[PDB]
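ok new one. same drill as before - structure tokens go in, u give me an amino acid for every spot. 197 of them this time. try not to just spam alanines like last time pls lmao
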């Protein structure tokens, strides 16, 4: 459901081929919130339940609404949490292909963490999806230090956070269809591009 800790819980003698690290939006529950479970179910269908590990960003990431106003669009403690999960993936399962995503504050968090990541780990992230990306205007639709071809941004018309504001309007809450279809589609395609079939 809304909490998945497959990387933390997983046996390193039986690593998955694909590890997905996902950060939820402000005020959302568990470590996957509203969109993450939808993405996860579609990744399990493509790779098999034992072929993919789903890991939400929990721990120090409290998804507090006010932290959207901080410099990087989230807290330093949250960035450290997400960086630590990428590092854990790299150490536990060195041969796994990584994929990532985030919604709202979680999109800012994914972007900041990927910017700060050691390059050798960053380069293992085959694709990243961002919904309601609160730094979309500021970062010109990119994740710093990360290629555009591996990035997919979902920013609805009328979602004010995508145009430089912090006001939450109805289109910000309308990413369900993207999470069910085009987002997992993109992630699956980017994994298959590097792993084959």
């Amino acid at each position: 459901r809304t909490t998945r800790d497959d990387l933390i819980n997983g046996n390193s003698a039986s690593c998955a081929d694909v590890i997905f690290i996902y950060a939820r939006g402000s005020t959302e529950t568990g470590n996957l919130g509203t969109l993450g479970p939808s993405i996860a179910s579609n990744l399990e269908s493509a790779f098999g339940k034992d072929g993919v590990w789903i890991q939400g960003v929990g721990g120090a990431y409290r998804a507090t609404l006010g932290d959207n106003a901080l410099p990087r669009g989230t807290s330093s403690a949250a960035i450290r949490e997400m960086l630590g999960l990428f590092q854990q993936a790299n150490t536990k399962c060195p041969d796994a292909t990584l994929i990532a995503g985030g919604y709202s504050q979680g999109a800012a968090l994914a972007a900041a963490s990927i910017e700060d990541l050691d390059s050798a780990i960053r380069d293992k992230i085959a694709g990243t999806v961002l919904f309601g990306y609160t730094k979309n205007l500021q970062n010109r639709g990119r994740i710093p230090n990360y290629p555009a071809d591996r990035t997919k941004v979902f920013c609805n018309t009328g979602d004010l956070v995508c145009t430089g504001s912090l006001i939450v309007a109805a289109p910000h809450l309308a990413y369900g269809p993207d999470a069910r279809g085009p987002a997992p589609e993109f992630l699956i395609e980017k994994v298959r591009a590097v792993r084959g079939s």
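The beta strands are 18-23, 52-56, 97-103, 125-131, 151-154. and btw The radius of gyration is 15 Å.
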